[PDB]
Amino acid sequence: NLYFQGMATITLERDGLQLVGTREEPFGEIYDMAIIFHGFTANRNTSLLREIANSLRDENIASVRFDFNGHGDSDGKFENMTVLNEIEDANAILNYVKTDPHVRNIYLVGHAQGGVVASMLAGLYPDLIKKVVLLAPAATLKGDALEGNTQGVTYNPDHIPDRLPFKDLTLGGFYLRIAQQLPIYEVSAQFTKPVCLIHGTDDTVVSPNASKKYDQIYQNSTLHLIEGADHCFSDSYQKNAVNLTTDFLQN
Amino acid sequence: NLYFQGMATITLERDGLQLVGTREEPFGEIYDMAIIFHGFTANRNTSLLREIANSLRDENIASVRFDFNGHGDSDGKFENMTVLNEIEDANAILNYVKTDPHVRNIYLVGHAQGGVVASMLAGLYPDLIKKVVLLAPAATLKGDALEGNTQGVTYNPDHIPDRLPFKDLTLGGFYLRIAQQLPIYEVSAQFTKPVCLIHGTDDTVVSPNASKKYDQIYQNSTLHLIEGADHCFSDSYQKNAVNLTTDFLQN
Ligand code: NA
Ligand code: NA
Ligand code: NA
Ligand code: NA
Ligand code: NA
Ligand code: NA
Ligand code: NA
Ligand code: NA
């Protein structure tokens, strides 16, 4: 605002769970604000999300970035997280943002499973959200759950187990049952304002076909295929993601 | 079980909210169990739900019936309830039931908005749930939200308000935004085991067309239109609901 600029740890509640976030507060009495969503097993402070928030703040666009339930600093077990209750988290965050009297336009920015949360939240609030940026949006998590193979762990999609050991973690069976039937494109397509789609051609985690499919479903989308980039836009590719996202939201 | 029979208040947790339920425990080491779901602004102990549980217990079929979040004895504000987080409650209850070693087959019984929760939960667990009974299932809540008229309170469906005063209560705007886009028939139609549909011809709250539509979508449904009955199967109509539900679950 006019008097305070910089970072601040902030906390919200959704159904009895605390969610922990970081707010980047820019100069000025009135400013736009992006809500930034991390992906599956990530957190609000990955290099990509930090550099997005930093670049936005340089342009005086505020942002907030929260850990989803079951992630990072927030409450809840990872095993109890699903894409649906992450959309419920995202709605609690949007409650916080849309009632801040300094906030002019609201933008959603989502990476990977956070891109599905962003795209679906924008389709539920198409009258409020002004622009969306999806980075490698993980709409393929539905097709993966239907196949029975979530990033190399396999299971019977017709009889999903109660829980699924997953590296160091335990994935809920209810996450997978929800994933199989999520109306990702149906809900997301209701957002007819500008969308920017950014996907690396060498993403091994989410097929670029996900963004190609979003680009067909949206009324107003621009697709950027970043030649050679991986799922996280790591190292030499990071600035491609950061620049496109910042340029998109500045106008 | 073999040693204890009768009622018991039971408590479960979903995301930091306590849910309060009543278990009817029948005779025998092994028995089937129905999970019974109340409707919008109701509670686990309406006359209809009590008499259903009582009649089932006479047949040695166990049951549990919980207050949804935002209702009755359970945690959470009514304003924060949606059909989606009631499905999340229902999944926490099913976790409890499917891990009880006395439980043989599991049945879902839902009245009104509880019928939508039941039908959608059965479509997410079509491999586990054995039979479903829907009583006046409120699948019309989606069409109502799209129209902008929820039981006589009106609003702009293209720009749903943050909150909607509703009699003595405050309905969340997010309830309505979710309702408009709920994939009720898509998800429910995945359950191909036996379904019993019970609807009163003079229901003024949920059009009988809801059960007529479910009867077309299911692979194995039986439709019972109760001549003259109202939304709650009150007074002289109650036994029509209770008898059909009990007969259905006994075999
Ligand atoms: Na953590
Ligand atoms: Na669907
Ligand atoms: Na376009
Ligand atoms: Na497009
Ligand atoms: Na209460
Ligand atoms: Na749908
Ligand atoms: Na049939
Ligand atoms: Na049928």
Numbering used by the authors:
A (entry chain A), B (entry chain A): -5 to 245
What does the paper say about this structure?
We determined the structure of the active site mutant (Ser106Ala mutant) and also co-crystallized this mutant with ferulic acid, ethyl ferulate, or chlorogenic acid. We validated that the active catalytic triad is Ser106, His225, Asp197, since the Ser106Ala and Asp197Ala mutants displayed no catalytic activity. The apo-LJ0536 structure was crystallized in the presence of protease, which facilitated successful crystal growth (the mutant Ser106Ala was also crystallized in the presence of protease). Overall, we observed no appreciable differences in the backbone structure between the apo wild-type (WT) enzyme and the Ser106Ala mutant (RMSD of 0.33 Å over all 244 Cα atoms). Trp160 of Est1E corresponds to Phe160 of LJ0536, and Phe160 adopts the same conformation in the apo and each of the ligand-bound complexes. The bridge-like structure formed by this residue in LJ0536, which lies on the first hairpin of the inserted α/β subdomain, is present in the same location in both apo and holo structures.
